[PDB]
Amino acid sequence: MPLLSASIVSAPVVTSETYVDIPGLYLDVAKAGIRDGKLQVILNVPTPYATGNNFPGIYFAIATNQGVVADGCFTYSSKVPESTGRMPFTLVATIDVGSGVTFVKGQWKSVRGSAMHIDSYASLSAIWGTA
Amino acid sequence: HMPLLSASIVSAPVVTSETYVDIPGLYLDVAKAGIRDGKLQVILNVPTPYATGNNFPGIYFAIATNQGVVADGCFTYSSKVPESTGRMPFTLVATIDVGSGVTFVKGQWKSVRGSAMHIDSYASLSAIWGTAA
Amino acid sequence: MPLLSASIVSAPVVTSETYVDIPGLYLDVAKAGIRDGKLQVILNVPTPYATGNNFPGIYFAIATNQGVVADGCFTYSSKVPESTGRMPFTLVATIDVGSGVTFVKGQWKSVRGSAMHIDSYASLSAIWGTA
Ligand SMILES: CC(=O)N[C@H]1[C@H](O[C@H]2[C@@H](O)[C@@H](CO)O[C@H](O[C@@H]3[C@H](O)[C@@H](O)[C@H](O)O[C@@H]3CO)[C@@H]2O)O[C@H](CO)[C@H](O)[C@@H]1O[C@@H]1O[C@H](CO)[C@H](O)[C@H](O)[C@H]1O[C@@H]1O[C@@H](C)[C@@H](O)[C@@H](O)[C@@H]1O
Ligand SMILES: CC(=O)N[C@H]1[C@H](O[C@H]2[C@@H](O)[C@@H](CO)O[C@H](O[C@@H]3[C@H](O)[C@@H](O)[C@H](O)O[C@@H]3CO)[C@@H]2O)O[C@H](CO)[C@H](O)[C@@H]1O[C@@H]1O[C@H](CO)[C@H](O)[C@H](O)[C@H]1O[C@@H]1O[C@@H](C)[C@@H](O)[C@@H](O)[C@@H]1O
Ligand SMILES: CC(=O)N[C@H]1[C@H](O[C@@H]2[C@@H](O)[C@@H](O)O[C@H](CO)[C@@H]2O)O[C@H](CO)[C@H](O)[C@@H]1O[C@@H]1O[C@H](CO)[C@H](O)[C@H](O)[C@H]1O[C@@H]1O[C@@H](C)[C@@H](O)[C@@H](O)[C@@H]1O
Ligand SMILES: Cc1nccn1-c1cccc(CN)c1
Ligand SMILES: Cc1nccn1-c1cccc(CN)c1
Ligand SMILES: Cc1nccn1-c1cccc(CN)c1
Ligand code: NA
């Protein structure tokens, strides 16, 4: 009954108009001998913030070796927030390992040129089951 | 042997409602899966919702079965009329007893103070089947 | 295939500089005969708010009998929010029970002297698995 988990405590701050991996949030599904069945994947980024001056925020995605499975974002409700507060983010998706999945990873990308910040615990977890 | 249930949507008609109404498509047919007993850990995941309105807007979300609401929570903005209605990620986790007579699990929502409710991207309802300790 | 769950509907409002238990968010792992393997733990506080006058917020942690496993926080984006809105918070961590884990619990602590509020459903859940 495999449980996969990866966690980080920081990432270099980057601005990106397109998805880039969150370094370290990666599960090697091949190395675990999972070749079929289903994975419930949670991307948990409980304390991120975004800096910028046009309604800042961050998109996050669960991706496999076949690309993005699901994505979401937080954004602030001010164009230039008084302070860039911590905006807890969770994304949950279920994947078919049998289609060719060798890995699951977290990615992120900028909302409107925002710099993306993780400076504390963030995780990527997966529970293996069947249909 | 180890079922994982999942349903996802990408949008819903924008509605205002003072009481819980189903989020269309966020439904798990538990009877169809032959789960008649045991426990379900259910996650309602609405990562990118927003609410529109003029009195501290927000949205309540619930996990419901055929026996009604199991658990609920809400997000709300911190301004009466937000400069822009930002995306407020929302997750709700609840564990249900299937053997009470649960045939289905669903997500519902309702307006905070007359807010219009918006999903325009990925949202999911997931469940892992288990047993008691 | 055990699923552990605990839920609450309120807690006395408190301010604390350091982690204190969220009363009622506790899983007795030993009492369930879980002695080894892995636990995917979810702390779900979907409708908390914080009151204060210095960028309010709340830190939340998953803790065992061996201390804090993972933690995160939300904060408002204003020094004195017009209204202290509901800021849904989820935290996910995976623990090794065989190290000496007898219980899992949720804890919280103040951001900048904030009073911490739960007045509706909050849960702590865990799925048991293996490496
Ligand atoms: C509250 C906060 O955001 N603290 C930040 C601080 O943010 C300031 C800026 O946003 C600034 C303008 O661009 O506005 C405020 O500052 C004004 C004034 O401009 C400032 O010079 C003065 O001293 O204070 C006033 C109001 O009191 C904001 O304070 O920016 C600094 C960067 O220089 C830090 O990021 C600070 O972050 C906090 O740093 C602490 C260490 O001193 C500590 O680690 C806190 O945990 C950390 O706060 C957390 O991260 C923030 C980014 C934010 O999410 C906050 O809610 C978190 O709690
Ligand atoms: C930032 C935002 O909310 N974008 C919305 C936009 O809202 C605009 C209004 O809030 C507006 C009121 O004057 O303020 C800004 O716009 C002004 C100006 O009025 C506008 O004409 C000019 O070009 O820009 C200035 C300031 O930059 C706000 O931008 O309403 C529009 C039109 O109806 C959209 O909803 C827009 O939503 C965004 O739309 C994008 C494509 O047009 C894209 O799809 C973005 O994802 C989407 O933004 C997201 O959803 C928003 C509702 C909000 O949650 C935001 O944080 C998200 O990123
Ligand atoms: C919008 C709100 O916060 N209502 C809240 C009120 O807040 C006011 C604020 O609007 C403005 O007037 O400034 C004052 C002074 O600081 C207050 O901050 O405070 C009241 C008590 O002091 C209540 O707490 C009131 O809370 C609402 O209460 C009604 C019943 O009267 C309902 O139960 C609402 O659910 C509840 O609103 C909910 O909680 C509040 C704290 C906030 O999170 C809302 O977004 C949320 O919907
Ligand atoms: C930003 C936005 N407006 C309407 C839909 N979306 C959106 C949000 C997150 C992800 C996606 C799909 N990549 C679209
Ligand atoms: C908004 C609020 N104030 C006190 C309690 N609540 C609340 C919030 C979400 C759900 C419920 C219970 N249906 C109550
Ligand atoms: C608040 C903050 N600034 C930088 C890092 N952190 C932070 C946030 C949540 C948890 C922890 C680790 N205790 C640190
Ligand atoms: Na692809």
Residue numbers in the entry:
A (entry chain A), C (entry chain C): 0 to 130
B (entry chain B): -1 to 131
Text taken from the publication that reported this structure:
Crystal structure analysis of the apo and the holo form of BC2L‐C‐nt demonstrated the presence of a druggable (ligandable) region (site X) in the vicinity of the fucoside binding site. Of the two other regions (X and Z), site X is a deep crevice extending along the binding interface. The study indicates that the fragments bind in a newly identified binding region in BC2L‐C‐nt when the fucoside binding site is occupied. Remarkably, the binding mode of one fragment (KL3) could be validated by X‐ray crystallography at high resolution, further confirming the ability of site X to host drug‐like fragments. ITC and X‐ray crystallography performed on one fragment confirmed binding at the expected location and therefore the ability of site X to host drug‐like fragments. The affinity measured by ITC is sub‐millimolar, which is very promising for such small fragment. The complementary structural and thermodynamic data give clear view of the relative importance of apolar and polar interactions for fragment KL3. This could be used in the future for structure‐based optimization of this first hit. The selection of suitable linkers can be done based on the distance (measured 4.8 Å) between the nearest atoms of fragment and the fucose core.
The bacterial lectin BC2L‐C expressed in B. cenocepacia is an interesting drug target involved in bacterial adhesion and subsequent deadly infection to the host. For BC2L‐C, the C‐terminal domain (LecB like) specifically binds to mannose, while the N‐terminal domain (BC2L‐C‐nt) has been structurally characterized as a novel fucose‐binding domain with a trimeric TNF‐α‐like architecture. Thus, BC2L‐C represents a novel type of superlectin with dual specificity for fucose and mannose in the N‐ and C‐terminal domains, respectively. BC2L‐C as a virulence factor binds to carbohydrates present on the epithelial cells of the host.
